[PDB]
């Protein structure tokens, strides 16, 4: 590949000028070693002061590997890079990927370093390895090849990737392969037995074309909007009924025909919260009709590709996290819950960071894009710590929730 | 003649769409013209500038200036217009090392690299934009027109290009003398080492012998400074550092500019003087712009200032960093949203100190502020030393565990230990997770009229206890809080409270321990006196009893 593809920013905007955030010494040392080798391999070059652009960089460790990896935060550049109708006017996100028994995630970011980047665009990939304590100027580099994490890299490599894979696709029409940023997602309806083989069958197939030993295995057979569930009780306190009427009133904004009249009537007078109230027949029937409404799907939900996906997350305690993905309030496209976040039982933020990564992964599989997160965390706490637990080579967008939502009760 | 390497030129362009400067040259006196001709003939002989013909259409004005005893003129070329039109650069000099992050060196010397500055050539295609004109005597001949061949003093790109050029020249010398440290800023070059002073002065000689390969003349800095070295506001002794002396003026009339430069001194001092406080003195500047307005210093501003004068009574000192030792940060609560901290490796030998002030908020609590202080110190420590310190915090381990396990947000603070130094950070109340058996149940409500601002707040209980108070100058949100407050006032030590106010639940579930609202504060004080409080929420106007009866009572 000698001939670069011309790329430009969107009209009327300059390249990114994002401040490098401070890094610990061990991450700096890791980045110096990685970049020295990259520079020896022609992938990056030192730049001069006439380049004013900057994109932040840090170092991670992919899930349970012990070698540092460089991650560039291209969020700003990606927002400023031209919209891509590269060889197509759009690559159909495979609507059948979300239905497959098993989906394996393959990092193929390394293939990008085989392709030169347009000489005129390289200055916009500028990044800085910072010094400790301002003791030296940072080490300044720009990319000479397609960088990992940049929006243009899968777009420009798409012509090569579809040709690299086609002999495998020809043999395996049952298998869905989808590319998002640096990753391939490979789904099949067969069992992990022959799935692993076909994954390594596919993997060594990449080797004959000019690779990474790692994987990650999903099962999108679960991914729905979880039902709203009401308690089944033989005795109800005033408090139980109040909580029920509150949950039902919340659900009546999602579902038509929810009624609380006969249940609210049980609460005639001014009773002690712990007092037991017998259910009448009318309240019993109303509850049953509400139960019947809630097992059917929400009316009028579908995905608008022109709109952002929004993801909300609630901390539920004891390692449990609930979340919802939607575009319009009360029209959830997906809801879910996690528990027992691996190696994190005493670190809220680590747990939250893994949930964010887990939800972003589901979002890519279902729709092919990342959601905007509403995170239950103060900005300064999140901004200080998330890079410590990040393991993905993409990064979504997020905003911070400072007022406790009452809805946490209803998802618990 | 010895071949010298050329310094690699940086390519420069003007901002897109912008042309170069076309500013008219001011008329000058005959004496100023004569002085400028003398100066530029010398600069021209040294290769700094060159004569151009009348083809160049750009121009930047040139002036002649003096000084008090300096009986001769100097040249000033005013590049303001060119700087507005020149591209942005990577400016790589904005911060300086903090002394507390430095390691002790046996020897250190300063080199003057002022001369090396104009041996840095200017990009060829860009020189045309630097043209200037010496007006002629009596304006009877064409002006003498010159352009720069080197980075001009005052041009927007000269600091970044000079610094970048020196860095690249120095890199081989630094990388292959790992027993040296070299730091550059302005036209000063600082070299430190742990070599005995014989071999240190020779590495210095090797360094000018390295710089000479680009023909850069570097003598020892004229009139050398000796311990302590005075640098960027600090004193650097060989085994300790501190700040240059801090002097707070006495005044019987303070203005808002007097005050904001008192805070600046106090802010400067707070990196080594522990316990500095500036909130009350910052409070006297919240909103004003004509900054010779006199302000009565409150007796709260005077006590703070007098407290500051007492800490400043003495010099204090910080030590340099030892990477083989642990890094520790201890925090103390000062009151009124203020926090102070010391970072150290050995007891009573601070690396540095600092302070943190509560963010502006409607409500807040001590644990949240302590958390923010931790994050600020974490980030500062990463800057300075490249690592997170181990923390010593005035909060019991069990208090923290209760806080983060029950708090609705995710939160975390890195490795830390309890230090028992009052006042300790604590949780002042915790709500029940379930309703309390045997505790009286208060159904509370409030309501106000938009127009009249007349309201009512009150409660009814399962024991038939009841209260409604009429209120003036109120709002729905205040009446909803006032009703909760009445229920807390009038109940025993354990109480169930039922509200329909999403607003009041949002405040209380945030667990404030202090507020900008006196009423919220009154609720907090009641909560503190209780043994158990369960707060339940129900939707309004939905027929749920108790809430229904109190709603009608307070809705006129
Ligand atoms: C940042 C910096 C500043 C100076 C200031 C000079 C002035 N004005 C000098 C150097 C080398 C600097 O740069 C670094 N300095 C250090 N450590 C320092 C070295 C100096 N000592 C003070 C001292 C020691 C010995 C004598 S003596 N006995 O010769 O009189 C006098 C003073 C404090 C620690 N470490 C690094 C690491 C990377 S850069 C750099
Ligand atoms: Mg009401």
Residue numbers in the entry:
A (entry chain B): 4 to 213, 227 to 428
B (entry chain A): -1 to 554
Publication excerpt:
HIV-1 reverse transcriptase (RT) (hereinafter referred to as RT) plays an essential role in the viral life cycle by reverse transcribing the single-stranded RNA genome to a double-stranded DNA copy. There are two main types of RT inhibitors: nucleoside RT inhibitors (NRTIs), which act as chain terminators and compete with incoming nucleotides in the polymerase active site, and non-nucleoside RT inhibitors (NNRTIs), which inhibit the activity of RT noncompetitively. NNRTIs are a group of structurally diverse compounds that bind to the non-nucleoside inhibitor-binding pocket (NNIBP) located ~10 Å from the polymerase active site. NNIBP is a hydrophobic pocket that emerges only when NNRTIs bind and induce conformational rearrangements of the residues defining the pocket.
While 25a and RPV exhibit similar inhibitory potency against WT RT, 25a is more resilient to Y188L and V106A/F227L mutations (0.70- and 1.7-fold change, respectively) than RPV (2.2- and 4.0-fold change, respectively). In the V106A/F227L RT/25a complex structure, the much smaller side chain of Ala106 buries significantly less surface area with the inhibitor. Furthermore, the double-mutation causes more dramatic changes in the conformations of the NNIBP and the bound 25a. In particular, the cyanovinyl group of 25a is flipped so that it can maintain similar extent of interactions with the mutated Leu227. This torsional change, however, diverts the inhibitor away from the tunnel lined by Tyr181, Tyr183 and Tyr188 and diminishes the contact areas between 25a and all three tyrosine residues. To compensate for the loss, the right wing of 25a shifts closer to Lys101. Such movement shortens the distance between the linker amine group of 25a and the carboxyl oxygen of Lys101 from 3.05 to 2.76 Å and strengthens the hydrogen bond between them.
